[PDB]
Design an enzyme around this catalytic site. Structure first.
Site, PDB file in Angstrom:
ATOM      1  N   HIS A 129      17.334  48.915 114.701  1.00 53.78           N
ATOM      2  CA  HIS A 129      16.510  49.819 113.880  1.00 53.78           C
ATOM      3  C   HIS A 129      17.104  50.104 112.508  1.00 53.78           C
ATOM      4  O   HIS A 129      16.393  50.492 111.610  1.00 53.78           O
ATOM      5  CB  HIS A 129      16.114  51.124 114.613  1.00 53.78           C
ATOM      6  CG  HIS A 129      17.237  51.899 115.244  1.00 53.78           C
ATOM      7  ND1 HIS A 129      17.671  51.663 116.539  1.00 53.78           N
ATOM      8  CD2 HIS A 129      17.946  52.965 114.780  1.00 53.78           C
ATOM      9  CE1 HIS A 129      18.593  52.563 116.827  1.00 53.78           C
ATOM     10  NE2 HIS A 129      18.807  53.319 115.769  1.00 53.78           N
TER      11      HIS A 129
ATOM     12  N   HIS B 220      24.150  55.095 107.843  1.00 52.19           N
ATOM     13  CA  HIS B 220      23.153  54.082 107.843  1.00 52.19           C
ATOM     14  C   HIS B 220      22.105  54.419 106.797  1.00 52.19           C
ATOM     15  O   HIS B 220      22.170  55.462 106.187  1.00 52.19           O
ATOM     16  CB  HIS B 220      22.450  53.988 109.228  1.00 52.19           C
ATOM     17  CG  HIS B 220      21.776  55.278 109.557  1.00 52.19           C
ATOM     18  ND1 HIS B 220      22.416  56.313 110.228  1.00 52.19           N
ATOM     19  CD2 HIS B 220      20.544  55.746 109.285  1.00 52.19           C
ATOM     20  CE1 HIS B 220      21.617  57.359 110.309  1.00 52.19           C
ATOM     21  NE2 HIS B 220      20.458  57.037 109.712  1.00 52.19           N
TER      22      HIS B 220
ATOM     23  N   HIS C  74      17.728  53.968 105.586  1.00 51.65           N
ATOM     24  CA  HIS C  74      16.318  53.683 105.824  1.00 51.65           C
ATOM     25  C   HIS C  74      15.744  53.103 104.543  1.00 51.65           C
ATOM     26  O   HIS C  74      16.124  53.572 103.460  1.00 51.65           O
ATOM     27  CB  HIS C  74      15.536  54.918 106.231  1.00 51.65           C
ATOM     28  CG  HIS C  74      16.115  55.646 107.378  1.00 51.65           C
ATOM     29  ND1 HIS C  74      15.728  55.442 108.670  1.00 51.65           N
ATOM     30  CD2 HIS C  74      17.138  56.526 107.431  1.00 51.65           C
ATOM     31  CE1 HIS C  74      16.464  56.226 109.461  1.00 51.65           C
ATOM     32  NE2 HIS C  74      17.366  56.850 108.751  1.00 51.65           N
TER      33      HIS C  74
ATOM     34  N   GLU D 247      12.976  58.760 103.815  1.00 52.47           N
ATOM     35  CA  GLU D 247      12.449  59.596 104.859  1.00 52.47           C
ATOM     36  C   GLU D 247      12.074  60.959 104.277  1.00 52.47           C
ATOM     37  O   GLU D 247      10.885  61.328 104.307  1.00 52.47           O
ATOM     38  CB  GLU D 247      13.436  59.692 106.024  1.00 52.47           C
ATOM     39  CG  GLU D 247      13.659  58.375 106.657  1.00 52.47           C
ATOM     40  CD  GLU D 247      14.145  58.480 108.091  1.00 52.47           C
ATOM     41  OE1 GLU D 247      15.134  59.208 108.329  1.00 52.47           O
ATOM     42  OE2 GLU D 247      13.540  57.817 108.966  1.00 52.47           O
TER      43      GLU D 247
ATOM     44  N   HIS E 212      22.025  58.069 105.089  1.00 53.44           N
ATOM     45  CA  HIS E 212      22.393  59.182 105.965  1.00 53.44           C
ATOM     46  C   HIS E 212      23.817  59.039 106.463  1.00 53.44           C
ATOM     47  O   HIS E 212      24.137  58.072 107.125  1.00 53.44           O
ATOM     48  CB  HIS E 212      21.493  59.179 107.183  1.00 53.44           C
ATOM     49  CG  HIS E 212      20.082  59.553 106.851  1.00 53.44           C
ATOM     50  ND1 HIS E 212      19.015  59.319 107.704  1.00 53.44           N
ATOM     51  CD2 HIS E 212      19.586  60.201 105.784  1.00 53.44           C
ATOM     52  CE1 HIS E 212      17.918  59.775 107.125  1.00 53.44           C
ATOM     53  NE2 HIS E 212      18.244  60.319 105.962  1.00 53.44           N
TER      54      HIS E 212
ATOM     55  N   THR F 143      16.082  61.743 112.939  1.00 59.21           N
ATOM     56  CA  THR F 143      14.835  61.093 112.562  1.00 59.21           C
ATOM     57  C   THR F 143      14.523  59.880 113.366  1.00 59.21           C
ATOM     58  O   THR F 143      13.473  59.239 113.119  1.00 59.21           O
ATOM     59  CB  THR F 143      14.773  60.771 111.062  1.00 59.21           C
ATOM     60  OG1 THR F 143      15.673  59.706 110.800  1.00 59.21           O
ATOM     61  CG2 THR F 143      15.058  61.969 110.194  1.00 59.21           C
ATOM     62  N   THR F 144      15.379  59.508 114.306  1.00 57.94           N
ATOM     63  CA  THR F 144      15.082  58.485 115.293  1.00 57.94           C
ATOM     64  C   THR F 144      15.156  59.074 116.660  1.00 57.94           C
ATOM     65  O   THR F 144      15.908  60.026 116.916  1.00 57.94           O
ATOM     66  CB  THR F 144      16.029  57.311 115.211  1.00 57.94           C
ATOM     67  OG1 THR F 144      17.401  57.762 115.275  1.00 57.94           O
ATOM     68  CG2 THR F 144      15.825  56.554 113.967  1.00 57.94           C
TER      69      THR F 144
HETATM   70  N1  LIG Z   1      18.313  59.136 110.943  1.00 56.59           N
HETATM   71  S1  LIG Z   1      19.286  60.407 111.216  1.00 56.59           S
HETATM   72  O1  LIG Z   1      18.784  61.690 111.563  1.00 56.59           O
HETATM   73  O2  LIG Z   1      20.434  60.403 110.399  1.00 56.59           O
HETATM   74  C1  LIG Z   1      19.876  60.374 112.792  1.00 56.59           C
HETATM   75  N2  LIG Z   1      19.118  59.877 113.855  1.00 56.59           N
HETATM   76  C2  LIG Z   1      19.758  60.039 115.077  1.00 56.59           C
HETATM   77  C3  LIG Z   1      19.369  59.648 116.394  1.00 56.59           C
HETATM   78  C4  LIG Z   1      20.240  59.941 117.413  1.00 56.59           C
HETATM   79  C5  LIG Z   1      21.434  60.647 117.220  1.00 56.59           C
HETATM   80  C6  LIG Z   1      21.789  61.101 115.940  1.00 56.59           C
HETATM   81  C7  LIG Z   1      21.023  60.806 114.857  1.00 56.59           C
HETATM   82  S2  LIG Z   1      21.326  61.265 113.238  1.00 56.59           S
HETATM   83 ZN   LIG Z   2      18.802  58.162 109.371  1.00 52.73          ZN
END
Ligand SMILES: NS(=O)(=O)c1nc2ccccc2s1
Ligand SMILES: [Zn+2]
Length: 259
Positions: free
Chosen positions: A63, A93, A95, A105, A118, A197-198
């Site tokens: 992803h 990572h 997006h 996002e 992020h 957000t995932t």
């Molecule tokens: N895309 S994010 O919010 O930075 C992020 N997504 C996730 C999913 C699972 C665990 C921590 C995070 S932190």
């Molecule tokens: Zn993220």
């Protein structure tokens, strides 16, 4: 097991079936209405202390790709700002979009940036990441917008390794990468309480979204867009548009660190 994604049948609009918190009260991302965000003079400067950050590896998880850090002691920490206590960097990572006009996002007065970085940190008072995500103040995510313009020299090491992690499940050693080279000049920010957000979309995040974007080149982001969501040998699905759209703000206030 998980089957969610960013494809035509398993994308954000479907996530709530497996993860009903998708329709929760503090979901992310959100649109930042800059006029409605209130300056909070009680907000402190953000302390980003990355001098001892130790990157280990880069992974294509299907992803996004994660640049992972050794978080077995306080080496790279975020504190201050809206935060109480100390939050340790675990991974970053991005997006991004299929075109420069989308990919972020968070949005700013409805503007979408080409991408969003992020930097994910967990609250050390909960001892490990998996415990932290079960708490409303478990994570602090530093979000940084990317626009397309001049190249970001500090990003190029990341770009150059992507060809080695094209498909889901591939990883590569990635040591000595310095995340300070991904930071804009100003640490002015917006903050609000939200979520990952995932999936599983846990409501554990204090968001800190920097106002100043970083600039990356078109060539840099074009290389993100060569990654694949699919595994080796499977039908190629370019890793693009791996962003969740803005969610309802509900009963939340976005605060600004700056006037
Ligand atoms: N895309 S994010 O919010 O930075 C992020 N997504 C996730 C999913 C699972 C665990 C921590 C995070 S932190
Ligand atoms: Zn993220």
């Amino acid at each position: 097991a998980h089957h969610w994604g960013y494809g035509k049948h398993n994308g954000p609009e479907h996530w709530h079936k497996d993860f009903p918190i998708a329709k929760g009260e503090r979901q992310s991302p959100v649109d930042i209405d800059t006029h409605t965000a209130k300056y909070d003079p009680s907000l402190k400067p953000l302390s980003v202390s990355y001098d001892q950050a130790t990157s280990l590896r880069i992974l294509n998880n299907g992803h996004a790709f994660n640049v992972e850090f050794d978080d077995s002691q306080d080496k790279a920490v975020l504190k201050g700002g809206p935060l109480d206590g100390t939050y340790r960097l675990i991974q970053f990572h991005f997006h991004w979009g299929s075109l420069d006009g989308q990919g972020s996002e968070h949005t700013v007065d409805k503007k979408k940036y080409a991408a969003e970085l992020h930097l994910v940190h967990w609250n050390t008072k909960y001892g490990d990441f998996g415990k932290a995500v079960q708490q409303p103040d478990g994570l602090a995510v530093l979000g940084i917008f990317l626009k397309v313009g001049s190249a970001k020299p500090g990003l190029q090491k990341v770009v150059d390794v992507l060809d080695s992690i094209k498909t889901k499940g591939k990883s590569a050693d990635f040591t000595n990468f310095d995340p300070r080279g991904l930071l804009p000049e100003s640490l002015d920010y917006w903050t609000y309480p939200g979520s990952a957000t995932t999936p599983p979309l846990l409501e554990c995040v204090t968001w800190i979204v920097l106002k100043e974007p970083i600039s990356v080149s078109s060539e840099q982001v074009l290389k993100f867009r060569k990654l694949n969501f699919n595994g080796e040998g499977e039908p190629e699905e370019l890793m693009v548009d791996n962003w969740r759209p803005a969610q309802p703000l509900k009963n939340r206030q976005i605060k600004a660190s700056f006037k």
